[PDB]
Structure formats: C-alpha cells, structure tokens
Amino acid sequence: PSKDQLNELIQEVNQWAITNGLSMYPPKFEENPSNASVSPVTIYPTPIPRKCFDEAVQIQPVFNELYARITQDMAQPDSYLHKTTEALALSDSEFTGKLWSLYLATLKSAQYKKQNFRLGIFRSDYLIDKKKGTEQIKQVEFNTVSVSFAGLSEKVDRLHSYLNRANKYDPKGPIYNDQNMVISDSGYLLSKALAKAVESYKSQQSDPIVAFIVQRNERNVFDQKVLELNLLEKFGTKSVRLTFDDVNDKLFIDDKTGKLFIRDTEQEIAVVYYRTGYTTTDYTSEKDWEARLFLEKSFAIKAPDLLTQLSGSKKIQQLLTDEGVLGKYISDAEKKSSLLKTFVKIYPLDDTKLGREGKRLALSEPSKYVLKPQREGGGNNVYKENIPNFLKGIEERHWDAYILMELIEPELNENNIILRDNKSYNEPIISELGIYGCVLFNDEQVLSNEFSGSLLRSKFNTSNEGGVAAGFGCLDSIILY
Amino acid sequence: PPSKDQLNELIQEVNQWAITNGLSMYPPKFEENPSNASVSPVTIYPTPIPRKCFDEAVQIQPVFNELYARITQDMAQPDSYLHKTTEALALSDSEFTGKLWSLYLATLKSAQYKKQNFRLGIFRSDYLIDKKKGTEQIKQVEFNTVSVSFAGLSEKVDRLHSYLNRANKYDPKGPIYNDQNMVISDSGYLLSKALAKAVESYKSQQDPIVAFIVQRNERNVFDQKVLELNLLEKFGTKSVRLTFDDVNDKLFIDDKTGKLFIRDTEQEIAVVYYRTGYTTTDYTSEKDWEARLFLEKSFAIKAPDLLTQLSGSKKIQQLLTDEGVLGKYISDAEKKSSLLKTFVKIYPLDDTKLGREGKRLALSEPSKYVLKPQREGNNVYKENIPNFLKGIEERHWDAYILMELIEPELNENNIILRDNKSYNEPIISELGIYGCVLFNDEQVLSNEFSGSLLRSKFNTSNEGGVAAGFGCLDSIILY
Ligand SMILES: Nc1ncnc2c1ncn2[C@@H]1O[C@H](COP(=O)(O)OP(=O)(O)NP(=O)(O)O)[C@@H](O)[C@H]1O
Ligand SMILES: Nc1ncnc2c1ncn2[C@@H]1O[C@H](COP(=O)(O)OP(=O)(O)NP(=O)(O)O)[C@@H](O)[C@H]1O
Ligand SMILES: N[C@@H](CCC(=O)N[C@@H](CS)C(=O)O)C(=O)O
Ligand SMILES: N[C@@H](CCC(=O)N[C@@H](CS)C(=O)O)C(=O)O
Ligand SMILES: [Mg+2]
Ligand SMILES: [Mg+2]
Ligand SMILES: [Mg+2]
Ligand SMILES: [Mg+2]
Numbered sequence: 017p018s019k020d021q022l023n024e025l026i027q028e029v030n031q032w033a034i035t036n037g038l039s040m041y042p043p044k045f046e047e048n049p050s051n052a053s054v055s056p057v058t059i060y061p062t063p064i065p066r067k068c069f070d071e072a073v074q075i076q077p078v079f080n081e082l083y084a085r086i087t088q089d090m091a092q093p094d095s096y097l098h099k100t101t102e103a104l105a106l107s108d109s110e111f112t113g114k115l116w117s118l119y120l121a122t123l124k125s126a127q128y129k130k131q132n133f134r135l136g137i138f139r140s141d142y143l144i145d146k147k148k149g150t151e152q153i154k155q156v157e158f159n160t161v162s163v164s165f166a167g168l169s170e171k172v173d174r175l176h177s178y179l180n181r182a183n184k185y186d187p188k189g190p191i192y193n194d195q196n197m198v199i200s201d202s203g204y205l206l207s208k209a210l211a212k213a214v215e216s217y218k219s220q221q222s223d224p225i226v227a228f229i230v231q232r233n234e235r236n237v238f239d240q241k242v243l244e245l246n247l248l249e250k251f252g253t254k255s256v257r258l259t260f261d262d263v264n265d266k267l268f269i270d271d272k273t274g275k276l277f278i279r280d281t282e283q284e285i286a287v288v289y290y291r292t293g294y295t296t297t298d299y300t301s302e303k304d305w306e307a308r309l310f311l312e313k314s315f316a317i318k319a320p321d322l323l324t325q326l327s328g329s330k331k332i333q334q335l336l337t338d339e340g341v342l343g344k345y346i347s348d349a350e351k352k353s354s355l356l357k358t359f360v361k362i363y364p365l366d367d368t369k370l371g372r373e374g375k376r377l378a379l380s381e382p383s384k385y386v387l388k389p390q391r392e393g394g395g396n397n398v399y400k401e402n403i404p405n406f407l408k409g410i411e412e413r414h415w416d417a418y419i420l421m422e423l424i425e426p427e428l429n430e431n432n433i434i435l436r437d438n439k440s441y442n443e444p445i446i447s448e449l450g451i452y453g454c455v456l457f458n459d460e461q462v463l464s465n466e467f468s469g470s471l472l473r474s475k476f477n478t479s480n481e482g483g484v485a486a487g488f489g490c491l492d493s494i495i496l497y
Numbered sequence: 498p499p500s501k502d503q504l505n506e507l508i509q510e511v512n513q514w515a516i517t518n519g520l521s522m523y524p525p526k527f528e529e530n531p532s533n534a535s536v537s538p539v540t541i542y543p544t545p546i547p548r549k550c551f552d553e554a555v556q557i558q559p560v561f562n563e564l565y566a567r568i569t570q571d572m573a574q575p576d577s578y579l580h581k582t583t584e585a586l587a588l589s590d591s592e593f594t595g596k597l598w599s600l601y602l603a604t605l606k607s608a609q610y611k612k613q614n615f616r617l618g619i620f621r622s623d624y625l626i627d628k629k630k631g632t633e634q635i636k637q638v639e640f641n642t643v644s645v646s647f648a649g650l651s652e653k654v655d656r657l658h659s660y661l662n663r664a665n666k667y668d669p670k671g672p673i674y675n676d677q678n679m680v681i682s683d684s685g686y687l688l689s690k691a692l693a694k695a696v697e698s699y700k701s702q703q704d705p706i707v708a709f710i711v712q713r714n715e716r717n718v719f720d721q722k723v724l725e726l727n728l729l730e731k732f733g734t735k736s737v738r739l740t741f742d743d744v745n746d747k748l749f750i751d752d753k754t755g756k757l758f759i760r761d762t763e764q765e766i767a768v769v770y771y772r773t774g775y776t777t778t779d780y781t782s783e784k785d786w787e788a789r790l791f792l793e794k795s796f797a798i799k800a801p802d803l804l805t806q807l808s809g810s811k812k813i814q815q816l817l818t819d820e821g822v823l824g825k826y827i828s829d830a831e832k833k834s835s836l837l838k839t840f841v842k843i844y845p846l847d848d849t850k851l852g853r854e855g856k857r858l859a860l861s862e863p864s865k866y867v868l869k870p871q872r873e874g875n876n877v878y879k880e881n882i883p884n885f886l887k888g889i890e891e892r893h894w895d896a897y898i899l900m901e902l903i904e905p906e907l908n909e910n911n912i913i914l915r916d917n918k919s920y921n922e923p924i925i926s927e928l929g930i931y932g933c934v935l936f937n938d939e940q941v942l943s944n945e946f947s948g949s950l951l952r953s954k955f956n957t958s959n960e961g962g963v964a965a966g967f968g969c970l971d972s973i974i975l976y
Contacts, residue, residue, distance in 0.1 A: 030531050051535045242517065
C-alpha cells in the first residue's frame with residue numbers, strides 16, 4: 017500500500033477493532049483497567065491452501081477422540097500409561113509432579129459419588145511443511161488446557177472480512193473472494209461446548225453456572241469475555257471469574273454430594289473452566305495447589321480435569337509417533353493413517369533404543385531438529401546447530417527432560433503487515449494454524465466430539481532498528497486458495 | 498447500596514463488558530496513540546423515568562420532526578418572519594450564524610445542474626422532567642438539528658445495564674429489575690436506517706456512499722463507528738470519514754450534474770452526513786467554510802443542509818412558544834396542544850413587548866430562570882442573572898434568551914463511573930429522543946422516531962473540587 021493508504025487502513029483497523037472489542041490489556045493495566053489496546057493483528061489475511069485447511073478441520077475430531085482415549089487409559093490406576101505418566105511427572109517434581117500428586121489425592125475415597133465426566137477444550141496447532149514440493153500440515157503440538165483466542169479469532173476474521181467487503185483494502189471494491197475468507201465461529205463453539213458440559217452436569221441430577229478460573233491480572237480478558245457473554249446470551253448460562261484466591265476464599269463443597277457452591281450467593285457451579293493453571297508461575301503458593309485440588313475433588317465437571325491436562329504432554333506426543341502405540345488408542349486404519357501423516361519424527365532422549373538414536377541424531381545432525389523441554393510454556397526451545405552446545409552443558413541423564421523434534425519447514429508469507437500499538441511492521445511471517453475441538457467424555461464413553469473453529473497465529477523474528485531478535489506474535493486470518 | 502467489594506467487582510464487570518463491546522471513547526491527546534481507548538463515562542445502574550413521560554416523549558418526536566421540517570421549508574421563503582428573524586440573528590452572530598447564512602445565500606445562485614432539494618434532518622429533542630407542585634411533565638431543554646451524538650453508544654449503555662441485570666451482576670441471586678421496564682434503544686440502527694433512506698431518495702433521482710464529515714481528532718469516534726458498520730452490514734452501503742481538509746483536497750463536483758465524487762477512487766457520494774460544523778471552532782479557516790459551501794452546492798443530500806441546521810436556533814425555540822407562531826406550522830389542534838405542553842416560558846430580551854416583559858422578569862424574579870446565549874457552557878442561572886446583564890450593554894441583551902428554569906428531581910441512588918473511579922453523587926438526567934425526517938422544499942417523505950438517550954451529570958463541591966462534575970451515559974428504567 018502507498019504511505020497514505022497504509023495509514024488510513026491502520027486507523028480503519030484501530031477503529032473497527034476498538035468498536036468490536038478486538039482488544040487486550042497492555043502491561044501494567046492494573047493501574048487503570050478502564051483502558052485497553054487493539055490486539056496485535058495482521059492487516060491482511062495470510063494464504064493457506066484449501067486442501068491443508070480442510071484436512072486440519074476434518075482430523076480434529078480424530079485428535080479429540082485420541083486424547084480422550086489416552087486420558088481414559090491414564091485414568092486406570094493399574095494401567096501401563098498411569099505408571100508411565102507417574103514416572104514422567106516425578107521427573108518434573110516442581111510442576112508435572114505436583115499436578116500428579118494432586119491427581120493421586122483425588123483417588124482417595126469420598127463420601128459422595130465422584131464426577132467422572134470431563135470436558136476437553138483442545139487446540140491442535142500446525143505448520144504447513146514444504147519439503148521437496150510436498151505440502152503437508154504437520155502438528156507442532158496438541159494443547160489440552162486453557163487454549164487461547166477462540167473469542168478474538170472470530171473478531172480478527174470479521175475485521176479482515178469487513179475491510180474487504182467495505183472497500184477499505186481497495187476503495188474500488190473487494191480484493192478477495194469472500195468464499196475464500198475463513199470466518200471462525202470458535203467463540204460461539206467453545207461456549208456451546210461449555211453449555212454441553214453444563215447439560216451433562218444437570219443430567220446427573222437448578223440454574224448452575226460456569227466458573228472461569230482465571231489468572232490474577234489476566235491481560236487477555238476480552239478474549240475470555242466473548243465466552244462469558246455467549247454462555248449467557250446464547251445459552252442462558254451465568255458464570256463468574258475466580259482466581260485461585262477467590263476459590264480458596266469464596267467456595268465450599270457440600271460434604272454429602274460433593275457439589276461446588278459460592279458461599280455468600282449459593283450459586284452452584286456445574287463446570288470449572290480453566291484459563292490458568294498451565295505453568296508453574298500460575299501457582300504462587302501452596303494455597304493455589306490446594307485450590308486446584310479442591311476444584312478437582314468437587315462434583316463440578318472440569319474443563320479440563322487433571323488427567324486431561326496431563327495427556328497433552330510432549331512425552332505423549334513423542335510416544336504417539338510409534339504406529340504400534342497409536343494403534344492402542346485408534347484402531348481404525350484410515351484415522352490412524354490420517355493422524356500419522358500430520359506427524360514429523362519425534363524422539364525421546366533416554367536410554368531406550370529410540371532414545372539412543374535421538375541422542376545420536378541430536379549430536380550428528382542437529383540442523384534438522386528443535387530440542388523441546390517436557391515442562392511447557394517457558395519459551396526455551398533450542399534450535400538446530402545450537403542443540404549440541406546446550407546438551408553438552410547438562411548431564412546426559414537430564415537429557416530425558418527434553419524431546420528431539422524434526423524441524424517443520426513452512427514457507428514464509430512476505431506480503432502481510434503486522435500492526436501493534438499503532439506501529440506497523442513489514443516483515444516475513446510464519447503462520448501457525450490452530451484448530452479448536454471440544455470433547456465431552458467420562459471414564460469409558462465419549463458423549464460429544466466436535467470441531468470448534470480455527471485460529472491463525474503469525475509472528476516474525478528479525479534483527480533491525482527495532483532490536484536483535486525483535487518480533488512478536490499476532491492474530492492473523494486465513495484466505496484459502 | 499453496594500458494599501465496597503461488591504462495587505469494585507461490579508466496576509470491573511462494567512469495564513470488561515464495555516471494552517468487549519466498544520462502549521468507548523478516546524481520551525484527551527489520544528492522537529499520540531490511537532490504538533488505545535477508554536470505557537465511556539457511564540452510570541452503573543439505570544435511572545428511573547416515569548413510563549408516562551417516556552411514552553409522551555417518544556410519541557411527540559414525529560410532531561417535532563414535522564414542525565422543524567416545516568420551519569425549514571418556510572425559512573426558504575424571502576418574506577417569512579422566520580427568514581427575517583434569521584437575518585437579524587446573522588448580524589448579532591456574524592462570526593457563526595452570519596457565516597452560515599452567507600453560505601446559504603450563495604447556494605441560491607444559479608447552477609448549470611438541477612439542484613438537490615431533499616435534505617435529511619437527524620434530530621434529537623432533549624427533555625428534563627419538570628416537577629412543580631406535584632405536576633410531572635417533560636419539558637424541552639432544546640431541540641438539536643445538527644450533528645446529534647450518542648445514538649451508537651446509547652444502544653451499548655442500554656445493553657450494558659440489561660446484561661448486568663440478566664447476568665446476575667447487580668445481584669448474584671437474580672435480576673433486580675423487571676426486563677419489561679428496561680429501555681433498550683435501537684438508535685444506532687435507526688439512524689443508519691434514516692441515512693439509508695436518504696441514499697434511497699438520492700438513487701431515485703438518477704453504488705453511492707455516505708460521507709461522514711468529521712471533526713479533526715474526534716474523540717467520540719466509536720459512537721460514529723456504530724453507524725458506519727450498520728450502514729454496511731444492514732444496508733449494504735459503504736461510507737468514508739472526511740474532515741474539511743479531506744473535502745477540500747479529495748472531492749470534486751461534476752459541473753454538468755453537480756454530483757459529488759472522491760477524486761481518485763471515483764466513489765459517488767449520495768449523502769453528506771455532518772458530525773462537525775456546529776460550532777465556530779469546527780471551522781478553523783475560511784477554507785473550512787468553503788468546504789462546507791462546496792458540499793452544500795453539490796447534488797448530495799445533506800444531513801442536515803444549511804437551512805435545516807439554522808432552524809434549530811434558540812431564537813426560534815423562543816418564538817415557537819407563542820401559539821400563533823406555532824400555529825403557522827402545526828394546524829392540528831391536538832398536535833399543537835401536545836407541543837405546547839412540553840414548553841416552559843421563554844422570552845426575548847429585546848425591546849419588543851415580550852422582550853420588555855423578559856427584561857422585567859430577568860431583574861425582578863431571576864431565581865425562576867436561566868439566561869442562555871443564542872450561540873451554541875455559558876448559561877447563567879437564577880440569582881446570578883442580574884449581575885451578568887448589568888455587566889453588558891442593554892442593547893446586547895438580545896444576544897440571549899430568558900428561559901424558565903425546569904426543576905426535575907435528582908436521582909440520589911446511582912453511581913457514576915469514569916476512568917475507573919466511581920462517584921456517588923445526585924444526578925440530573927436529560928432524556929433525549931432521536932427522530933429523522935426526509936423532506937424537500939414542500940413535501941415530507943419519511944418521518945420517524947429513531948431511539949432514545951439518557952445523559953446524566955452531577956455538580957458538587959467536595960474533595961474532588963468546587964463545581965466538580967461531568968456528564969455520562971445513563972439508561973432508563975420505567976415505572
Ligand atoms: N517442530 C517444529 N518445527 C518448527 N517450529 C517449531 C517446531 N516446534 C515448535 N516450533 C516453534 O515454537 C513455538 C513454541 O513451540 P511449542 O511446542 O508450541 O511450545 P510450548 O513449550 O508448548 N509453549 P505454549 O505454546 O505456550 O504452550 C511454536 O509455536 C513454533 O513457532
Ligand atoms: N430551562 C432549563 N432548566 C433547567 N436546566 C437547563 C435549562 N436549559 C438548559 N439547561 C441546562 O443546560 C445544559 C446546556 O443548555 P443547552 O440549551 O442544552 O445548551 P447549548 O448552548 O445548546 N449547547 P449544546 O448542548 O452543546 O449544543 C442543559 O443540558 C441543561 O442541563
Ligand atoms: N491465560 C491466558 C493464556 C493461556 C495460554 O497461554 N494458552 C496457550 C497454551 S494452551 C495457547 O497457545 O493457547 C488465557 O486464558 O488466554
Ligand atoms: N462532534 C461530536 C460531538 C457533536 C455534539 O457536540 N453534539 C451535541 C450537539 S447536537 C449533542 O448534544 O449531541 C460527535 O459527532 O459525536
Ligand atoms: Mg504452542
Ligand atoms: Mg504447549
Ligand atoms: Mg443541549
Ligand atoms: Mg445546542
């Protein structure tokens with residue numbers, strides 16, 4: 017775009033975004049939460065092959081079923097996966113081990129029937145791998161807890177649709193075919209899933225609510241608000257926002273039924289939906305771990321419960337790459353095949369046959385991999401030629417704290433513009449396709465399993481006047497081709 | 498009354514719902530970073546308004562629309578009292594009215610194309626609920642004929658309060674209000690529908706757009722955006738935002754047809770909708786006055802055009818209080834009576850008989866009035882009136898009107914929220930009713946009620962300062 021065209025387009029974006037709540041709190045918003053900023057976004061949609069997008073959408077229920085079955089297997093105290101997971105958890109005592117200890121505590125006898133239905137609100141993330149001309153969605157990871165952006169996704173998609181249909185991209189007319197402009201309904205669909213869990217809770221017995229368990233001073237609250245509003249306006253269901261402090265201070269469990277209530281209001285909580293509790297810093301003291309256990313012991317349906325959260329571990333992602341292991345959870349030949357083609361090679365770094373080969377590859381051909389820690393979210397992946405130096409810096413026995421993953425090689429989009437805090441950036445971006453999926457299941461049955469929308473997160477990483485390794489992520493949208 | 502904790506939670510509920518829904522405004526100096534905005538100043542709860550009063554205000558709007566459409570049509574005629582009255586006002590206020598009048602005269606010159614005679618009045622009638630000796634009656638503060646605000650944010654504050662009620666935020670145990678009594682304005686949609694109607698009239702005379710003429714660095718952009726989005730999503734009509742600089746730099750008129758176009762895009766403008774040009778500071782140089790004349794001479798339908806804007810003067814408001822004058826525009830006895838019931842006494846301060854009566858009253862019983870400058874925060878109230886008048890030459894008192902003071906009851910049970918701070922102060926609430934009327938030199942083609950608004954404000958001397966206070970958007974609970 018010209019200089020003047022870009023500036024007018026930027027103000028069109030800020031204006032539409034603010035009018036529609038496509039927003040996020042800035043750092044230190046605590047000082048004045050009556051103000052918010054436009055969420056970081058691209059100005060144009062990013063091209064994604066229609067074949068790739070359709071494949072991602074179609075396989076989501078298969079992934080939902082797979083992770084539900086894995087969770088169910090983990091839920092059997094006498095199973096091999098239960099032992100396997102305990103072993104992995106004990107290796108990460110500061111986080112995974114604490115989650116595991118809470119889970120063991122839920123196995124103790126209760127005076128009431130326990131809640132066995134759980135809701136998995138998931139997101140499968142992909143990079144479109146391009147090797148020797150073959151284009152194939154490849155899974156980066158599978159998210160099983162507190163997945164973000166279902167609400168803002170709907171809004172960035174509608175922002176770009178608007179700019180196209182309202183002749184803002186070009187005053188003479190649309191520059192895109194609206195039939196190729198993806199418009200996610202992920203906000204509505206996640207709310208529908210939460211309502212489904214409420215339906216399940218009621219069927220086991222009243223105007224129960226959904227308790228949103230949130231991070232203290234959460235900056236991404238407007239993304240979450242879309243779900244709170246949809247639950248009320250579309251599903252007539254109320255909700256509350258509770259931090260771990262609020263859980264400890266305001267909730268109680270009825271000893272005879274296990275039902276969860278807000279003390280001074282008598283509101284009954286049907287579903288505990290987590291938007292916090294996925295990284296060590298989310299638990300600021302032993303009291304927060306106690307709060308999580310309290311919620312997990314109650315009769316409310318958790319979204320997700322402890323085991324479902326634990327099923328999304330990098331170790332399990334690695335394990336599933338073995339066709340024999342996969343087949344213990346998905347026996348359908350075609351589903352199994354469909355799943356395997358979205359996987360790249362992933363190796364453990366332990367003393368097993370596979371682990372020894374991973375160690376050999378990590379040192380001999382590091383350029384082809386990314387070393388990823390089993391404890392998630394720390395932003396500590398180690399790439400390519402940097403791998404040997406990192407590994408040599410720690411005892412070989414501790415290499416098991418990581419997995420070695422084949423590097424996915426997507427094409428970069430060189431024709432988009434990123435907007436953040438009224439500043440634009442013309443840099444090449446990598447785009448990660450997210451597909452939401454929600455599955456309601458218990459110890460053995462699966463009651464609802466659906467595709468729940470899409471997301472496209474893009475980011476750039478460059479060294480320029482903005483700094484070395486400058487760059488950040490933003491919400492993008494999809495134009496199919 | 499909310500406890501500290503309950504109020505603090507309710508305040509965050511409001512901030513969160515407001516930001517998520519665009520119930521927002523730019524703060525001062527937002528120009529430094531327009532990617533950031535604040536929650537609009539709003540009340541936490543709705544304010545009680547008698548159902549009878551609300552219904553009366555809604556039902557009378559089309560009558561006021563017709564009245565001002567007729568006044569505007571009369572003003573076009575050289576021999577009418579109004580035409581003449583306006584001329585005098587153009588001398589008294591040559592810096593503003595005088596300049597608008599001169600532009601109007603300039604539009605009377607011949608053109609080589611057929612001129613556009615349809616105009617769209619997007620009005621708002623504002624009321625205070627007078628309470629004198631147990632007599633409850635809506636009384637008109639003023640009638641606004643140009644660039645009326647808040648139709649978009651009105652919808653949102655009404656929906657904010659409805660949500661707080663239905664989502665058990667006002668009370669965790671259930672709703673505290675009957676939803677049947679909670680007014681939910683559709684003024685954003687209805688103003689957009691009126692603009693679409695003007696577009697329809699423009700097309701009937703031949704994919705044109707609506708040009709929003711806006712103030713440079715407008716802080717109330719989100720209120721306007723509601724209309725832009727509705728025009729597109731509900732009426733498939735595009736629009737652009739243009740300051741007077743943009744009008745001068747980017748638009749041209751086809752000499753043969755008078756049609757208005759954006760130069761390099763070829764977009765055709767069907768309607769010129771003003772959200773600026775109502776006060777002297779909106780015209781920063783002669784170039785802005787020229788930009789206004791350029792738009793007015795074009796074939797686009799103006800909302801409002803020059804004469805329609807001029808019809809909403811305080812002088813005309815004063816003249817209409819005489820039944821004989823009103824009767825020149827409204828012949829229906831019942832419509833006439835309904836209008837008169839909403840008027841308080843209003844006097845000139847010139848040397849006409851009524852004016853000399855006004856002067857007597859202003860000095861003998863000032864406590865019953867408010868002195869208002871004819872040019873549109875300069876009102877002078879009650880006992881402060883004599884001192885103010887004594888300070889200016891009597892011959893210039895004609896620059897004001899003397900209006901009976903409306904005395905509403907204050908709502909002492911609401912909380913005002915702005916920039917995260919709450920204020921628990923009594924407020925006065927002014928009911929606004931929007932109305933849109935499409936008309937030409939003689940016919941009135943569409944005339945509708947277009948929604949509601951409730952603006953509240955407080956004024957106190959306390960820890961926040963002397964005469965501290967500001968206005969905010971409120972909502973209505975009927976009873
Ligand atoms: N195999 C891969 N090939 C190429 N890039 C990758 C690969 N794996 C991860 N990445 C990049 O690294 C980012 C973070 O890796 P990811 O597995 O999502 O991390 P995390 O530790 O799980 N944290 P979080 O996303 O916050 O839960 C991704 O979004 C990608 O940009
Ligand atoms: N007759 C009255 N009785 C009581 N209060 C009044 C009266 N007239 C005006 N006011 C108050 O004064 C405010 C401003 O007066 P108003 O006539 O609305 O102003 P203005 O000069 O037309 N400008 P604007 O509203 O910015 O276009 C009103 O909203 C009222 O609060
Ligand atoms: N707590 C935040 C952020 C949660 C988060 O980090 N989610 C990651 C991991 S699942 C995502 O990629 O969505 C929220 O609720 O939006
Ligand atoms: N320029 C601003 C403000 C216009 C304005 O001041 N409107 C007054 C006078 S009509 C109102 O009371 O609505 C906007 O367009 O929102
Ligand atoms: Mg990730
Ligand atoms: Mg992760
Ligand atoms: Mg006013
Ligand atoms: Mg006025």
